[PDB]
Amino acid sequence: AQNPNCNIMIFHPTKEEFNDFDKYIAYMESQGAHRAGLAKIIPPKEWKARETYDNISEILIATPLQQVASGRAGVFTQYHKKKKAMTVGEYRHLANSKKYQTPPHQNFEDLERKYWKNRIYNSPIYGADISGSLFDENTKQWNLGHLGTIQDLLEKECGVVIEGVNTPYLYFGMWKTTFAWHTEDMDLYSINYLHLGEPKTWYVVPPEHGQRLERLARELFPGSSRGCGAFLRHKVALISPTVLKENGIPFNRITQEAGEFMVTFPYGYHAGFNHGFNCAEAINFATPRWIDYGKMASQCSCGEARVTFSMDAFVRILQPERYDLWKRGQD
Numbered sequence: 001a002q003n004p005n006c007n008i009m010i011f012h013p014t015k016e017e018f019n020d021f022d023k024y025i026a027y028m029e030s031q032g033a034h035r036a037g038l039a040k041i042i043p044p045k046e047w048k049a050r051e052t053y054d055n056i057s058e059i060l061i062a063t064p065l066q067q068v069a070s071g072r073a074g075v076f077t078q079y080h081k082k083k084k085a086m087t088v089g090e091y092r093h094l095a096n097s098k099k100y101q102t103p104p105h106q107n108f109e110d111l112e113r114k115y116w117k118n119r120i121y122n123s124p125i126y127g128a129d130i131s132g133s134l135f136d137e138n139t140k141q142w143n144l145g146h147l148g149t150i151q152d153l154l155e156k157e158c159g160v161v162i163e164g165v166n167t168p169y170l171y172f173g174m175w176k177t178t179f180a181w182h183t184e185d186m187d188l189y190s191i192n193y194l195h196l197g198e199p200k201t202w203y204v205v206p207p208e209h210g211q212r213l214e215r216l217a218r219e220l221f222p223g224s225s226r227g228c229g230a231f232l233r234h235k236v237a238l239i240s241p242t243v244l245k246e247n248g249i250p251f252n253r254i255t256q257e258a259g260e261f262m263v264t265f266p267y268g269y270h271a272g273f274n275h276g277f278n279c280a281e282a283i284n285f286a287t288p289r290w291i292d293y294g295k296m297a298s299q300c301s302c303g304e305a306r307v308t309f310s311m312d313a314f315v316r317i318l319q320p321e322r323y324d325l326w327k328r329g330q331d
């Protein structure tokens with residue numbers, strides 16, 4: 001078995017290997033990359049996502065989210081307080097202000113220490129989940145707006161034609177902005193490209209060990225666990241690496257820099273934080289190997305998780321027994 005310790009793997013495809021996205025995902029899996037839950041892909045030196053980022057300031061962040069924490073430094077939840085709209089140029093100035101800017105630090109490890117020590121005492125503002133793309137239409141390789149759609153994958157594998165669409169999302173971050181522990185909707189893959197700015201640190205649990213993280217989470221968030229049998233789908237809970245180590249939960253960590261792709265694999269729990277002003281783009285995708293994970297994915301039916309239009313068909317076709325209860329949660 002390849003990669004039996006479930007380490008995060010880093011890949012350096014050539015320009016020729018960068019042509020066929022599905023084939024390269026399958027290659028990475030042949031080398032065991034999925035066992036980690038997360039892989040890094042460094043594009044060939046010849047590739048670029050677009051010519052420049054000099055003209056992005058007028059993009060609108062219609063509903064910036066202030067991420068307010070409750071709990072203790074290593075075990076906390078966050079809620080998202082809606083703020084007034086602002087442009088990307090306005091947000092970048094805010095991120096660089098004395099109130100929100102990255103502190104002086106020695107290296108990524110020192111900054112990680114400062115994040116875990118101090119995150120809860122601040123409420124950074126995140127521009128998340130903004131439909132759109134920064135890939136130039138002429139970029140033909142690994143263009144996250146031109147991937148094969150998950151509806152077309154389900155149709156190819158299973159023969160059933162379904163409604164729904166699959167488009168990318170932009171994320172504009174600042175110091176301490178935080179993504180809580182989660183897997184993707186329907187335990188899909190994700191791919192994330194860091195277009196510009198400061199790094200993003202990731203933490204990930206191997207898919208084969210995801211139930212260990214769930215059991216810890218039920219212990220650490222006991223009221224939430226009673227409210228919903230899949231409360232990590234709410235995307236609000238954080239657990240530090242120190243706490244994970246204290247409880248014997250297998251995980252790994254890596255820092256993504258501008259110009260790099262990360263791929264999350266089905267049922268790979270992940271969480272992380274931004275180091276300073278940045279912009280990422282991400283989208284979900286599927287492969288044939290996903291289908292079995294989609295059929296087994298947990299679902300939130302308490303009403304909190306509320307998701308896209310396109311998840312309806314995935315539940316309806318892959319999980320017909322759960323469909324009625326899940327849909328009640330959506331309404």
Ligand SMILES: O=C(O)CNC(=O)C(=O)O
Binds near residue numbers: 264
């Ligand atoms: O970048 C972020 O805030 C969160 N991204 C992801 O969880 C992802 O790409 O799967």
Ligand SMILES: [Mg+2]
Binds near residue numbers: 055056057058059
């Ligand atoms: Mg603009």
Ligand code: NI
Binds near residue numbers: 182184270
């Ligand atoms: Ni994710």
Ligand SMILES: [Zn+2]
Binds near residue numbers: 227229
């Ligand atoms: Zn729920």
